[PDB]
Amino acid sequence: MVLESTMVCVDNSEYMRNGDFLPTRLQAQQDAVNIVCHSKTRSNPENNVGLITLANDCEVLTTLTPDTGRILSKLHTVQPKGKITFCTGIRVAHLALKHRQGKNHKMRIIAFVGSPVEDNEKDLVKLAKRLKKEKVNVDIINFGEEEVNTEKLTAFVNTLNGKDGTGSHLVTVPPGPSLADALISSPILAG
Amino acid sequence: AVDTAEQVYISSLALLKMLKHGRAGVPMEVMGLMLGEFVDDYTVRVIDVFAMPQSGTGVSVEAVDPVFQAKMLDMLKQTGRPEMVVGWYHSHPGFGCWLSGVDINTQQSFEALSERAVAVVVDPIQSVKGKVVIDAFRLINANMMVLGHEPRQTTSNLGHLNKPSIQALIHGLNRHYYSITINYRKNELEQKMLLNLHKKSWMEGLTLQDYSEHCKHNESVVKEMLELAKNYNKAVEEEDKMTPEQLAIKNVGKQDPKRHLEEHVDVLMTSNIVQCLAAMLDTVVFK
Amino acid sequence: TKQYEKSENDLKALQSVGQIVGEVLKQLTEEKFIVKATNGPRYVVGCRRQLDKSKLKPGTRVALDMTTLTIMRYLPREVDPLVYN
Amino acid sequence: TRPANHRQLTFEEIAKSAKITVNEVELLVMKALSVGLVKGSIDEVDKRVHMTWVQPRVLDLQQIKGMKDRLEFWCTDVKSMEMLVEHQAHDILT
Amino acid sequence: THELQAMKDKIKENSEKIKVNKTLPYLVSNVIELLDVDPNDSQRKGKCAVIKTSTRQTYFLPVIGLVDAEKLKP
Amino acid sequence: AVQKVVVHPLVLLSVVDHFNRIGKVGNQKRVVGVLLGSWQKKVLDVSNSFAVPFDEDDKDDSVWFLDHDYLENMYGMFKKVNARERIVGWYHTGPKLHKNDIAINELMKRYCPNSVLVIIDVKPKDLGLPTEAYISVEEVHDDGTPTSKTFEHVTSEIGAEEAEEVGVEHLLRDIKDTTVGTLSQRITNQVHGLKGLNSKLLDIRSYLEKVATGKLPINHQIIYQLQDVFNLLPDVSLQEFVKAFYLKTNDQMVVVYLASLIRSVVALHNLINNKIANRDAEKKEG
Amino acid sequence: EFLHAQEEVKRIQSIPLVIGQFLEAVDQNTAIVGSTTGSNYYVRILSTIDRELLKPNASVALHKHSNALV
Ligand SMILES: [Zn+2]
Secondary structure (H helix, E strand, O other), rough: OOOOOEEEEEEOOHHHOOOOOOOOOOHHHHHHHHHHHEEEEEEHOOOOOOOEEOOOOOOOOOOOOOOOOHHHHHHHHOOOOOOOOOHHHHHHHHHHHHHOOOOOEEEEEEEEOOOOOOOOOOHHHHHHHHHHHOEEEEEEEEEOOOOOOOOOOHHHHHHHOOOOOOOOOOOOOOOOOOOOHHHHHHHHHOO | OOOOOOOEEOOOHHHHHHHHHHHHOOOOOOOEEEEEEEEOOOOOEEEEEHHHHHOOOOOOOHHHHHHHHHHHHHHHHHHHOOOOEEEEOOOOOOOOOOOOHHHHHHHHHHHHHHHOOOEEEOOOOOOOOOOOOOOEEEEOOOHHHHHHOOOOOOOOOHHHOOOOOOOOOOOOOOOEEEOOEEEEOOOHHHHHHHHHHHHHOOOOOOHHHHHHOOOOOOOOOOHHHHHHHHHHHHHHHHOOOOHHOOOOHHHHOOOOOOOOOOHHHHHHHHHHHHHHHHHHHHHOOOO | OOOHHHHHHHHHOOOOOOOOEEEEEEEOOOOEEEEEEOOOOEEEEEOOOOOHHHHOOEEEEEEOOOOOOOEEEEOOOOOOOHHHO | OOOOOOOOEHHHHHHHOOOOOHHOOOOOOOHHHHHOOOOOEEEOOOOOEEEOOOOOOOHHHHHHHHHHHHHEEEEEEEOOOOOOOHHHHHHHOO | OHHHHHHHHHHHHHHHHHHHHHOOOOOOOOOOEOOOOOOOOOOOOOOOOEOOOOOOOOOEEEEEOOOOOOOOOO | OOOOOEOOOHHHHHHHHHHHHHHOOOOOOOOOOEEEEOOOOOOEEEEEEEEEEEEEEEOOOOOOOOOOHHHHHHHHHHHHHOOOEEEEEEEEOOOOOOOHHHHHHHHHOOOOOOOOOEEEEOOOOOOOOOOOOOOOOOOOOOOOOOOOOOEOOOOOEEOOOOOHHHHHHHHOOOOOOOOOOHHHHHHHHHHHHHHHHHHHHHHHHHHHHHHHHOOOOOOOOHHHHHHHHOOOOOOOOOHHHHHHEEEEHHHHHHHHHHHHHHHHHHHHHHHHHHHHHHHHHHHHHO | OHHHHHHHHHHHHOOOOEEEEEEEEOOOOOEEEOOOOOEEEEEEEEOOOOOOOOOOOOEEEEEEOOOOOO
């Protein structure tokens, strides 16, 4: 199977507590963690997946482990109130990826951005060239309400990698009512 | 096949885990394992030492837990250096650290798996400070009864290892077993700082505090022990003035001297602490 | 489930070996006290740091360590037959 | 304030500064002993007041400077004298 | 709420160590029982017990370990 | 709370040998591990420890993580083999703690009620007894600010018990021991004195440098009270300090009087007996 | 270094030392003694004190390991 370590990032920003995604984004992104942890389980047994809180202070409560049980426990009562913070959210998972015992696993990060961010374009392009030097491939899936047809995030994924690098894909929520399972139905079949 | 004089390069961390794992089990004998790397036949090194848990079967070949070895080596893989296992060791705090019947009963298993698997024993009891103590053992091959039992060549470390000849019951194991030499490799920087670490005892705690604590007491209440020292003056020297007259009666030395020598000269060395540290007051009080 | 682990943590106190009974016979210095085992060997050991010899006295039923044989704990009075008569 | 100590004062100093009668300077200084700012004792023969210790309050960069002067003097004191001590016995050590 | 089975696993592993270290009955012995606690002269807690042996010896031990003062008088 | 800690040479080396572990691969940052303490009483003692791989980004200088599975099952390993050992905190090699080291203790406060972090030093240079000890405590402030954690310094001392004494006491093989009464006290007069000179010198150099550069605060708070504590005692005579002078002279009377007494006794015995056995051996043989 | 050796022999040994039931001194530097467990022994005595305080009948503290005459 493919060798890599996937680090899932839940969105704890205060804008993620609304029930626009049925029944609530808390359970919606919980099912999103359910489908990414079960797919990586069906992908390779050697994949270890932790969680990271992006907004406010960034702390990983569950050390990187192949078992998602403790991750599912932290999905409940997470108290996702705070202001979204982007620039640190990728690097905090990058440090968790440098603590891996085995060096044969590729560095992989999946994050959810459900809130408008104040991150400047200079900061995301500095992280883009930094990830170019660090080879890390990040697959982001945009939830929630944000700038219509997100650009700085799309340009972030574009300028993140190149040639090929097969790759970083960005999935933005369509402007219409839908279930969270329908939003994650596309990435699970094809990245 | 080929046999040559052997030398065990040890790390201070190995010896620390040795005596630490042996001190926590006193009197009961514990069971550890030796960790290191085999470079060649005539030289060997132990770069790490870890301890095995104590079980109900006591010290036995079954006491080694396989799932403990799998999880430890996994914890060594996430540790900086995951070196392969080499040999075993067990402490003997209660006696002269000689191999028992169970020690060889696990030795044919450690020589089965591992080619060498040098057995080491350590005890705290023998010397509190100035001796290596510990021990060394290696099982000679019983299949060598055909050929001769008396190697090695370059007898330097061999003839120097045999001495003292280590008693009788220990060198009673010299039949079917033989010791191995141990030297301390530097690593001088850590050896020097850890040298000063224990020197904090007799020098001072911080190299400042304890003799600034000698500036705390500083004759205090240190004259009380001078009053007991001057009571040792009166006591010892009132029978010291009876000695030279008796020397004239018995004509002369009975060999002797009673000693009844030196002593309070050291009290006068504390008087050097009196004059010096009190002369510091002129520096302390003025500016 | 939790009470079973409490009995497990109970057993985490039981690996510590029990000391040896002793009778303090007399004393010599603050580090040396005449003591004998129930089987007859006489020793002189040091005490622990909590006690005063007023808590010991000569001719006192006590206990010693299993290695250092140091004076640690004690009880003044014991016997088998008394109450069972 | 005084370099002192020279920590023994007189009744004229307290009674003139505090402009209070000589009978109330007892209550004055001894209440300060109860406040805890000074542990000193009062000599009532000449009616003198002997202070002990002091209560530090505030004190300035000029004081950090003179503090380096009081320090560096202690530095060269111990350095000189102690380097003279073992200057004598450095030979015999070897 | 799912850690009860994990605690059941740690009490099965440690009671497996109670299967290897009970610690096994082998040598026959006899008892002497008492209750004690240590004030000083800081404050601590505990209890002690006494024992006989098959070799005639006697020992001073913190309270058993494994079964308790439940039974019996010696 | 925690007053003083006893740091054995075993735990210090257990950090430094791991500084060889990740030091051969380098590069930056520090060696961080979990500290295994032993608490018999208010005085804290340390016996063993273990180190965990740790990395800290600078970007993001506040990001830190440890392996809890390593802390969990190895604690299950070390508690198994030794039931007396438990984790009292963590440690790092410093040399000076960055502001991010607080949250590490706040994460492991679930393991131990009070976690004491021990800064250590792998390369001995200055000024004295190595390492350091900081206890996690909330002191708030006299300024009534929202409660923040500034770790209070715990005095650290080096000690051992039995076997840990055996190893190092044989490993010295360096300087005379002690020797009691002659070189010991006077070399300590050099070290404690001179290292006390450059201590407060460089520390008073920081006193003025912090006022020159680094403001704010900086100065306030403790500056005015601490510096006045320096101005507590100048402290010279007159008067009673003059009485202490010749009283101290009256103190040296007895000891030097006794010195002359030992001189007469040592000279009497040794000289008389030696000349006896000397003149006798010469007149009998010659 | 000889003063250091004096610190060794004065540190040697124990603390704690088992006292034993002494019978007689057979000849130079050695003697026979029963322990407090009642078994006669043959041991070379401690060097610095040969005789004066040993006496025919006393109770001599015997080395922990060796049961040496001290
Ligand atoms: Zn054995």
